[PDB]
Amino acid sequence: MKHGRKIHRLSRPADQRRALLRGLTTQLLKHGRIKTTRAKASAMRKYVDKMITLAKEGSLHKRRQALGFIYEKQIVHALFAEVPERYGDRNGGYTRIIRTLPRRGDNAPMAYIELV
Amino acid sequence: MIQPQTHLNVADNSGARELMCIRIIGASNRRYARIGDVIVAVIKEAIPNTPLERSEVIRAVVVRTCKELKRDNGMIIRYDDNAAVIIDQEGNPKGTRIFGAIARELRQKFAKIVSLAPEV
Amino acid sequence: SVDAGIGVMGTKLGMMSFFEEDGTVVPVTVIGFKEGNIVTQVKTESTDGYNAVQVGYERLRDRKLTMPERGHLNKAGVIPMRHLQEFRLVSVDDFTPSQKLLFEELFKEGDMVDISGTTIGKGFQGGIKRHNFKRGLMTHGSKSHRALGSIGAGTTPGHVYKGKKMPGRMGGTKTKIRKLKIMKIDTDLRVVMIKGAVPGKPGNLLRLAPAKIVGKNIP
Amino acid sequence: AVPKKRTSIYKKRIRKNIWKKKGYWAALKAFSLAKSLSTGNS
RNA sequence: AGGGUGAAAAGAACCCCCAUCGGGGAGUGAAAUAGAACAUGAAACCGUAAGCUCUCAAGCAGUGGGAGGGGGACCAGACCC
RNA sequence: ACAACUCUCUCUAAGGAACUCGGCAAAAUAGCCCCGUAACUUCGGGAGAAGGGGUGCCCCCUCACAAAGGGGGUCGAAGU
RNA sequence: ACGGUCCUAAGGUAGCGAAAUUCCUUGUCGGGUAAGUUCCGACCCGCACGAAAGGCGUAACGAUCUGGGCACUGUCUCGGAGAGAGGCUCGGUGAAAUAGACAUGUCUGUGAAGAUGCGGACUACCUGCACCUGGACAGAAAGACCCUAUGAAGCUU
RNA sequence: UCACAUCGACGGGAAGGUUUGGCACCUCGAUGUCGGCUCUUCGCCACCUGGGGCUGUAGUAUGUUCCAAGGGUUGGGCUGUUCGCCCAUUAAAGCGGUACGUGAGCUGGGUUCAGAACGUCGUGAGACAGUUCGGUCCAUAUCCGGUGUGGGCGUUAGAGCAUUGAGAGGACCUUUCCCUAGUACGAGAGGACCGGGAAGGACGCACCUCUGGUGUACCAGUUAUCGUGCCCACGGUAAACGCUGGGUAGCCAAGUGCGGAGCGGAUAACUGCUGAAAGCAUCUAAGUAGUAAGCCCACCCCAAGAUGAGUGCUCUCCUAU
RNA sequence: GAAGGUCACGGCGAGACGAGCCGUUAUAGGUGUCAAGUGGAAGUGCAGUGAUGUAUGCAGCUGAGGCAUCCUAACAGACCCACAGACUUGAAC
Structure with a gap:
């Protein structure tokens, strides 16, 4: 029973x-901040963090590993170039969940997710 | 895990080719019989000219089963077939030869079976 | 009620396959311990109406406790702890407070111990899983599958009988599994190895106390 | 299946007032958040 | 199936809330406790306010007895809840 | 959110109709090529009877057999 | 098989027969199964088959009825796990049949003979939500059965 | 041999309300008719399991009947069937009430609609508890009632802990084998009472170490086609895994542990001791002892809403806060 | 603002919702690592006309489990509550 x-x-x-x-992860990576629900956000921390971790070991293999994921070539090439400079220090936990006001037409709880 | 209506190969040369189980004996209200237990079976086919004809209710004792019996050792033992041996009444089987392979658990209640076995 | 010795609190830590030099493979529960099993209060015929000993378990930072409990434990002169459990005995003396209970010395192996503890919680569950009901047919057009079928009789009883078995919350309750072999007492690690199974997942409290047979208690 | 009579009055009041108390609880919680909105939150 | 603001449209300039709707002051009028959903406005049904009063009860809900409490700007062994 | 229960589905150790009014429902069979095909018959049938074997991928013989046919290799537990 | 005697227009020929006909009845016998009120073949005591309301056979064909086998499996032993759509919670919109009045316990007794309401006992803080259907002679349709009406209507001679 | 071990003719007297009736009292502005599934519960007039008397009781195994309703009372073949017969078992295959329990829980094989046929009755339409094939089973729970689970209030100042047990439930089931002992008994054939060990069956409680199922989370192969510009290598789709082959955790059993215990109490049938009424006798009128899976404590879970609201330990009583 | 309770905040082997229990500077997630599963990646080298094999490599990918570490979120904070306890008798410093 769960x-x-x-x-x-x-x-x-x-x-x-x-x-x-996948798509949420792509858009988040692209823009850098997104507004979505709490659950859609809180679930997303396994995949953003996994992909930033994947961008540490920039190798033929790992880029294809990541490129199966994102479905947008030009975002994943932004990483690998970007990541190790602007995340080299940071050891896990690359993602912040700010939390802001329910959505109008369904009292749906709401949040922000963006890179730390 | 032999139960009512299970088809069972014969592991000796009493003449019967294949059996079908119709009851467990010993420990009443038993769902099914695992290795060691005695069952009742009808013979569903035999070699033509033997004493044990077809369509006769007779006792057998289960020796090969597809459902792992366990030692206290920790070793478990499947087979690839469900097969029993046609017991006479109390003691030995009718034939004077047993085939296949059979376990040590059988030798406490059925001494004469593991006497005649090839590869125990 | 009246327990056959003083018990000892404990914590479940999964299951081990334990061998012996025969080669008998035995299933076993590893039971660990945390600061104490320290005696707290002693009750008497004199003042409290019965004979009993209260025994804490599991150490804490003393902010997570409340004023009253802080007082109750600081009266005994004892480490901060949760889980005060009693043990009603006939024997009363030599259990004066702030005295540690040596699980090593108070059991002595091959004992057969009685372990209680709260079980795994299976939520609100159906008649089948709860009370070992049978289910109806699957085909031959049966619109009944898993259900209670009829409840009661007819106009004569004219109502549903009290304690009629129904769907409800199965699990999350205390059950004494009694008579269980102590296989090994690891002096090194302070870890008791008990044959078989025990209520709850790894983590639960366990009230570990000796066999409570009817030649041991009260005729 | 079907109701035998009507609940009519007084019972329906008792039933509705608990539902309005659900509203009350929500009001308390929303009042609590307004103070949180004032000052800090990082 | 669906009539009745006023004698007279005099049907609300102006101000405030305010994107609208609608509302409150102002103004008109004998009256707006006649504002267009407008005249008299019963009952069921829905509330808001005050007096008393139920959480060891069992009841076609009243009735006879009536503990304790409350009154009505009108001093009663009277009367009412 | 991931309680019972109902439905639309997916799988299931050992057994294999013991179910049940009744194998209802589910499962299994399945394309093509080659071999093979009984009682009976109104001599047209029965008949795709039944029952078996081969099928993926690569490389080859042929002055004419829709990845043919045949020969040889190679991969998977499994080749319509 | 063979005769006697009565009645009748004449007394069932071939064939088939316990059947879509068979009451007695699960007829009896044999086959099929460990075991067969169903099934197959034979018997004939055909209650009450029978020759164009055809008789008896028959290859083929059947979303036809009715028995048996092989393969196959959650049909079952005996359940278990998981995916969806609901159910549950939050926000938005928002029905229904039903409804004398309802301050609507259990037991046994009573009574239009089967009571939340009457008598005696017993039990029982007040109030939600989730689940379950034993009762409210629960809801639904002035019983379609049965019988009545010097009712109605079809059909027959 | 002897009515009274076991049967009991001719006759007589009772209870029960399960059968087939008689009556026509409630219900025709509807209370759904059999059998099956699911889930109960209760009765004793006891099928087995506990304990007895008598026996035409040598023992074994009975027969009979007294106490006892705690527990249990299989799996198939045939029939719509309950019932019944039969096969294989077994400690045994108990009999009844509860609207012949239970259709706002299920089923629709039987029986009460329309079609069609056979036999028969009917001049005919049509008919026949005669037969045959085919034939639509509703429902979102107001209340009581139940299983769960909250909230309020109460418990007299308010709290956090620990428990006491009125009360209430669950569980106290059964099998052969071995020793006693081939002993007692019995000519032999056979074969105990009493008690102590054995491994099971059903049943319940708990767990996942082992064996596994599942495990659309994970890993691997492979078909078709589309996308990533192209080869390589990945991704999508083939409902709510494209199809397979594996599987950690969780959950599950076919898997693992545990359980049923008492030289405790009062009893039921029964056996007694002492002992009169009635110098004797007599289990009783005084008194008292053995003595059952039945009854009560004990085991296990709940429990002071036990308004009768118990008991213990400890903490807190400043002000606009 | 007492003791304490309720909310909020991160959760759970607890759970339909409430409830229960843990956490709020080792609670969940992430990261690191290690049991475990699966079965030998990609890239490149070499072998073969080729399908393919083969070495680098118990690899690679997972990791619901354990353990480590504050990298992220447990920020911000709110609400409720106090007369030392009516009344009567009798023992007691």
């Missing part, structure tokens, strides 16, 4: 869950 089961569903099937996390 004992020791840890996975953020996002109300969806696995079709669309990975589709969400």
Whole structure:
């Protein structure tokens, strides 16, 4: 009965869950700050952090590993060039969750996610 | 894990080719019989000219099973077949030869079976 | 109620396969300990109406406790702790407060111990899983599958009987598993090795006290 | 399936007032957040 | 199926809330406790305010007895809740 | 959010109709090529009867067999 | 098989037969299964088959009925796990059938003979939410059965 | 041999309300008719399991009947069937009430609609508890009632801890084998009472170390096609895994542990001791002892809403705060 | 603003919601690492006409589990509550 089961569903099937996390991850990486729900945000910390971690070891292999993910070549080339300079010190936890006011037309709880 | 209506190969040369289980004996209200237990079976086919004809209710004892019996050692033992040996009544099987391979757990209650076995 | 010795608090730490020089493979629960099992209060026929000993467990920073509990433990002159549990005995003396309970010295192996503890919580669950009901047919057009079927009889009883088995919250409750072998007492590590299973996942409290057979208690 | 009579009065008041108390709880919580909005939060 | 602001549209210039709707002052009028959903405005039903009063109760809800409490700008062994 | 329960689905150790009014429902079979095909018959059928074997990928013989046919290799537990 | 005697227009020929006909009845016998009120073949005591309301056979064909086998499996032993759509919680919108009045316990007794409401006992703080359907002779349709009306209507001779 | 071990003719007297009736008292402005599934509960007129008397009781195994309703009372073949017969078992395969329990819980095989057929009855339309094939089973729970779970208030100053137990539930089931002992008994054949060990069955409580199922989270192969400019290498889709092959945690059992125990109390049938009424006798009128899976404590979970609101330890009582 | 309680904030082997329990400078996540799963990546070298094999390499990818470390979020803060306890008798310094 969900004992020791840890996975953020996002109300969806696995079709669309990975589709969400992927696209959200892309847009977040692109813009640098996004407004979304608390759950859509709080689930997203495994994948942004995984991809920044993936951008430490900039090698043929790891770029393809990341490039299967993002579905936008020119964002993932921004990383690898960017990351090791502006995150070289920081050891994990590259992501901040600020939290701001429910959405109007459904009392949906709301948040900001952006790079730290 | 042999139960009512299970088809069971015969591991000796009493003549019967294949059995079908119709009851467990010993420890009533038992769901199914694992290795060591005695069952009742109808013979579903035999070699033509043997004494044990087809369609006869007879006792057998289960020796090969697909459902891992366990030692206290910790070793477990599957087989690839569910097969019993046609017991006479109390003691030995009818044939004077047993095939396949069989476990040590059998030798406490069925001394004569592990006497005749090839590879125990 | 009246327990056959003084018990000892403890913590579950998973299961081990424990061998012996025969080669008997035995399943076992590793049980660890945390600061104390220190005696706290002693109750008497004199003042309190019965004989009993209260025993704390598990050390804390003393901000996480409340004033009253701080007082109750600081009266005994004892480390900050949660989980004061009692042990009602017939025997009363030699349990004066601020006295540590040596689990090593108070059991002595091959004992058969009775372990309580709160179980795994399975939430609100159905008639099948809860009370070992059977389910109805799957095909032959049965619109009943998993259910209670009928509840009661008819107009004569004219109501549902009290304690009629129904869907409800199964689990998260105390159950004494009693008579369990002590396989090994690790002097080094302060860790008791008990044969078999024990209520709850790794973490739970356990009230570890000796066999409570009817030739040990009160005729 | 179907109701035998109507609850009519007084009982329906008792039922509605708890629902309005849900509203009360929300009001308390929203009042609490306004002070949090004033000063700090980093 | 769906009539009745006023005698007279005199149907609300101006100000405030304010994107609208609508509202409060102002002004008109005998009256706006006649404001266009407008005249008299009963009951069910929905509230708001005050007096008393229920959380060991069992009840076709009243009735006879009536503890304790409250009155009505009108001093009662009277009367009412 | 990830309780019971219901539905639309996916899998299931050992057994294999013991279910049940009834194998209802589910499962299994399946394309092509080659071999093979019984009782009976109104001699047209039965018949795709039944039952078996081969199928992926690469490389070759052929003055004419829609990745043919045949020969040889190579990968997977598994080649419609 | 063979005769006697009565009645009748004449007394069932071939075939088939316990059947879509068989009441007695799970007829009896054999086959099929460890075990077969169903099934197959035979018997004939055909209650009450029978020759164009055809008789009896028949290859093929059947979303036809009815038995048996192989393969196959959650149909079952005996359940278990997981994915969706609900259910649950929050915000927005917002129905229904039902409803004498409802301050609406259990037991046994009573009574239009089966009571939350009547008698005696017992039990029971007040009030939500989730689940479950035993009762409210729960809801639904002035019983479609049965019978009545010197009711209605079809159909027959 | 002897009515009274075991049967009991001719006759007589009772209870029960499960059968088939009689009556027509409630219900025709509807209370759904059998059997099956699910889930109960209760009765004793006891199928087995506990404890007895008698026996035409040598023992074993019975027969009979007294106490006892705590527990249990299989899996199939045939039939719509309950019932019944049969196969294989087994400690045993108990019999009933609860609207022949339970359809606002399920099923629709049977029986009460329309179609169609056979036999028969009917001049005919049509008919026949005669037969055959085919034939739509509703529902979002107001209240009581139940299983859970909160909130309020109460408990007399307010709190945090620890418990006491009125009360209330769950569980106290059964199998062969071995020793006693081949002993007692019995001519032999066979084969105990009493008690102590054994490994199971069903049943419940808990767990995941082992064996596994699942495990759309994870890893691997592979079809089709599309995308990443192209090869390489990845991604999408093939409902709510494209299809397979593996699988940690969790959850699960077929897997692992544990359980049922008492030389405790009062009893039921029964066996007694002492002992009159009635110089004797007599288990009783005084008194008292053995003596059951039945009853009560004990085991295990809940529990002071136990308004009868218990008991203990400890903390806190300043001001606009 | 007492003791304490309730909210909020990060959670849970607790959970339908409430409830329960832990945490609020080792609670969850991340990062590091290690059990464990799966089975030998990519790139390149070499072998073969080629499908493919083969070495670098118990690899690579996972890691719901354990352990480490404040890198991120547990910020900001709110609400409730106090007369030392009506009343009567009798023992006691």
